[PDB]
Amino acid sequence: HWGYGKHNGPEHWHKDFPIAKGERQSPVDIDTHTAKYDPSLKPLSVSYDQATSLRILNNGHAFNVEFDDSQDKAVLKGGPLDGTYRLIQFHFHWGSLDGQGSEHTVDKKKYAAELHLVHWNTKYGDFGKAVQQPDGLAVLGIFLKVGSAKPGLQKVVDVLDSIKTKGKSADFTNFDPRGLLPESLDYWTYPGSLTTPPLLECVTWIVLKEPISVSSEQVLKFRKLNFNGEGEPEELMVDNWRPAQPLKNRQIKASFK
Ligand SMILES: On1cc(C(F)(F)F)ccc1=S
Ligand SMILES: [Zn+2]
């Protein structure tokens, strides 16, 4: 099945998922000089005070921190969005080395990792119906650089030993995703896609300009996870990022001057 290796990595995905070579695929390189300021954009509204985390899951491609999305508890609105998007899960993409790992790049610069907070448009009722729509999702993307530790990340790093291999989950209640946000909500936005199969073109991407800093020890612990299941040859979960895809007929808009 798909993955990130030589034989089943991103350059292969198009054979099972032809939309891989579609018109609005993600990630992309953000050319900062050509992203135009759009003064009609709104401040993003991130309302996470009532977020209810439930569980953390190693799905064989990344780990997901899952939320109860049965009510309007943790929502994203404003910015480029019409309506209200509900948080369902977050996950990361990261490298085997600090020099790589993010999916979006900024003037071709790769960060050590990239956090994706996935939200679905509540007008569609649930996640599975939202991914049938071109405005079904909004993904808040936040870059990670290695430097100072991020205290708000440590509860995630500390649970990873309990979900080392594919298919493992752990209770993961009362985690506050506000602790993963940088100071500034200045962002770039463009229409794109999921960055793993099935690569659906549902996503309004909102990528924050300000990275968060995480420590070398925090990211080292992400790299001890495994893509394989228990009892299988160990294959470290590293380099689970898709490279930048052609921008095609898209414009990236900046919320800031
Ligand atoms: O790529 N991708 C995939 C998913 C899911 F959950 F549908 F698998 C959600 C968000 C993103 S970015
Ligand atoms: Zn992702």
Side-chain angles (χ1 to χ4, degrees), residues 2 4 59 64 88-89 91 93 103 116-119 127 131 137 139 193-200 203 205:
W2 75 266
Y4 295 95
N59 61 21
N64 291 352
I88 174 164
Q89 54 111 315
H91 59 277
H93 306 268
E103 293 207 307
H116 285 166
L117 296 132
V118 179
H119 311 73
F127 178 87
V131 305
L137 302 185
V139 184
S193 68
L194 308 186
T195 65
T196 64
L199 303 169
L200 295 167
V203 185
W205 277 96

Side-chain angles (χ1 to χ4, degrees), residues 9 13 63 68 74 99 119 161 175 211 217 250:
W13 296 347
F63 61 86
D68 168 21
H119 311 73
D161 283 338
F175 180 76
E217 295 88 353
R250 304 174 281 179

Side-chain angles (χ1 to χ4, degrees), residues 55-229:
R55 190 172 80 131
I56 186 173
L57 166 75
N58 177 331
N59 61 21
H61 311 102
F63 61 86
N64 291 352
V65 174
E66 296 164 347
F67 289 82
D68 168 21
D69 68 346
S70 63
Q71 303 177 249
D72 266 339
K73 271 177 194 203
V75 302
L76 180 74
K77 63 196 263 278
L81 306 170
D82 291 336
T84 293
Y85 293 67
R86 196 174 287 178
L87 179 68
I88 174 164
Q89 54 111 315
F90 72 78
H91 59 277
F92 305 79
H93 306 268
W94 63 89
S96 57
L97 302 168
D98 296 352
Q100 65 195 47
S102 64
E103 293 207 307
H104 293 93
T105 53
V106 178
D107 300 323
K108 306 290 179 109
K109 175 187 167 92
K110 293 175 170 84
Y111 290 87
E114 182 172 327
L115 166 63
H116 285 166
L117 296 132
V118 179
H119 311 73
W120 58 268
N121 193 328
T122 57
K123 79 188 226 162
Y124 302 125
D126 60 18
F127 178 87
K129 175 66 47 160
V131 305
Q132 306 183 40
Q133 321 295 155
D135 61 345
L137 302 185
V139 184
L140 179 61
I142 296 176
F143 294 118
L144 279 63
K145 65 178 189 178
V146 175
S148 294
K150 197 65 171 176
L153 182 66
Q154 192 58 35
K155 292 187 312 183
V156 173
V157 166
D158 280 340
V159 82
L160 302 179
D161 283 338
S162 77
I163 57 153
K164 187 177 184 193
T165 47
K166 183 175 54 183
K168 289 196 156 275
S169 71
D171 299 317
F172 199 64
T173 57
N174 300 106
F175 180 76
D176 188 345
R178 291 183 296 187
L180 298 175
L181 306 179
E183 288 180 0
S184 185
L185 294 182
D186 285 347
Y187 62 87
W188 294 281
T189 182
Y190 76 97
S193 68
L194 308 186
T195 65
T196 64
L199 303 169
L200 295 167
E201 293 178 337
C202 315
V203 185
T204 296
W205 277 96
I206 299 176
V207 177
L208 297 190
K209 164 189 196 187
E210 185 183 327
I212 56 163
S213 284
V214 305
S215 66
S216 179
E217 295 88 353
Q218 286 182 318
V219 69
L220 279 164
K221 287 179 187 179
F222 281 24
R223 308 174 179 133
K224 297 179 114 230
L225 291 167
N226 280 184
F227 289 126
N228 58 280

